[PDB]
Design a protein around this ligand. Structure first.
Ligand SMILES: N[C@@H](CS)C(=O)NS(=O)(=O)c1cccc(-c2cccs2)c1
Ligand SMILES: [Ca+2]
Ligand SMILES: [Zn+2]
Length: 413
């Protein structure tokens, strides 16, 4: 659909380690990721404003690990990401910034492209803009109208189409929150608990009808725009199908977003489980709020690259913590990545070093354990201390360690 970014080289490392075990946010426990021969991943993409902040980075870098660890095990991978190129935050940024919303999003998607290519994240295989996915969303919203799972609000001028929360008996399994806590998040994450004519406070917009002053598209439900959640479950369903191994994104999406996407797809395919694994991750600004230009807490990787930070240092930086930990960027973390990058690059430049077959198996093992990069970086800190301090005799373990750090981690040594 849309052009993504370019793929870095992917060396193949001989051998295999343990199969991936990931934490599933839904079941609140670590279960094995058992994929098919074609392994499938959908990660919620960007809303094209605020370039690539470290929250975006931390997120797509984490699924890079899954992407890469899957490839090393021998799986072929179908990775679909999306762009929310029409969205209410986007319009608010456009109107404040005195710039057109489409011109904004196109330039911001371009900035994301370059930051991902700079960070050596493997591209998705289908890159789908939300505006390029109206037909799929209409075709879906038709099917939930037919099953009564959706309805049209009693508003002839603004005939919004809404999704019944109880359209599905298992609604709430992924998020796990009670109704009181679900309500108060809905209002803080771009939803309408006060919209008149609604059957349930927690029903989610499926098709927002034409408002004056707003872009829109024709449909059997009137003219207007799609809703957020149905966008992603539509693209996910049509490009992959009922057997989705991983659904991932930033942490805010545990609810509403991912809860409702699953609810939509399950209500139309009859499936009980939309995704075998729900995976969430994220960075926060210095203030404990999500990063945004509005808050004055935005750090762009573009600004770090300008500050002269190696893109690999950004990887080691963010990987120094576990992905379900409370990651925070700082000059402290930047220096540990810079020292760690220096230390690793000198060991891999040695003429001969001790055998590495072991430390490769320890790294393959730590990553398969819910992506345990803290313990995987330390095993490499140790193979480096032994090599620099004491030396070895494999004239091949330098290059082998370099190229396995590249394949599995994306770090360029
Ligand atoms: N377009 C939607 C998804 S359909 C969206 O959420 N877009 S986004 O640009 O807000 C975004 C994307 C990826 C990660 C994060 C964050 C992770 C942790 C903190 S923020 C934020
Ligand atoms: Ca659950
Ligand atoms: Zn999404």
């Amino acid at each position: 659909g849309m052009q993504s970014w370019s793929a870095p080289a992917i060396p193949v490392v001989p051998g295999r380690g343990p199969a991936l075990r990931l934490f599933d946010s839904a079941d609140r426990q670590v279960r094995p990721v058992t994929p098919g021969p074609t392994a499938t991943m959908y990660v919620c993409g960007i809303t094209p404003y605020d370039a690539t902040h470290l929250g975006h980075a931390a997120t797509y870098l984490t699924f890079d690990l899954v992407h890469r660890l899957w490839l090393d095990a021998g799986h072929t991978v179908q990775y679909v990401q999306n762009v929310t190129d029409v969205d209410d935050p986007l319009f608010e940024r456009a109107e404040r910034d005195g710039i057109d919303w489409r011109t904004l999003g196109d330039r911001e998607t371009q900035l994301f492209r370059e930051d991902m290519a700079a960070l050596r994240v493997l591209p998705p295989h289908d890159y789908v803009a939300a505006t390029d996915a109206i037909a799929e969303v209409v075709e879906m919203v038709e099917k939930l109208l037919a099953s009564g799972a959706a309805y049209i609000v009693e508003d002839a001028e603004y005939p919004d189409v809404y999704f019944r929360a109880d359209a599905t008996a298992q609604f709430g399994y992924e998020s796990g929150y009670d109704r009181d806590t679900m309500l108060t998040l809905f209002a803080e994450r771009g939803g309408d608990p006060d919209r008149p004519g609604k059957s349930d406070q927690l029903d989610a917009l499926l098709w927002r009808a034409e408002r004056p002053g707003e872009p829109s598209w024709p449909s059997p439900f009137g003219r207007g725009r799609p809703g957020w959640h149905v966008e992603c479950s539509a693209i996910a369903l049509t490009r992959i199908g009922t057997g989705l191994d991983i659904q991932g994104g930033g942490s805010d999406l545990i609810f509403p977003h991912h809860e409702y996407s699953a609810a939509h797809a399950e209500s139309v395919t009859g499936e009980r489980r939309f995704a075998r694994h729900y995976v969430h991750t994220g960075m926060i600004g210095w203030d404990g709020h999500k990063m945004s230009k509005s808050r004055g807490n935005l750090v762009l990787v573009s600004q770090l690259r300008a500050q002269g930070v190696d893109p690999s240092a950004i990887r080691l930086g963010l990987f120094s913590g576990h992905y379900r930990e409370d990651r925070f960027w700082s000059n402290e973390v930047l220096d540990e990545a810079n020292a760690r990058l220096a230390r690793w690059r000198s060991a891999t430049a040695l003429p001969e070093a001790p055998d590495a077959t072991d430390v490769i198996a320890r790294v393959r093992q730590y990553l398969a354990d819910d992506l345990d990069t803290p313990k995987a970086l330390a095993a490499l800190d140790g193979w480096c201390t032994d090599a620099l301090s004491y030396g070895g005799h494999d004239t091949e373990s330098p290059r082998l360690v370099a190229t396995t750090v590249d394949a599995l981690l994306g770090v360029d040594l």
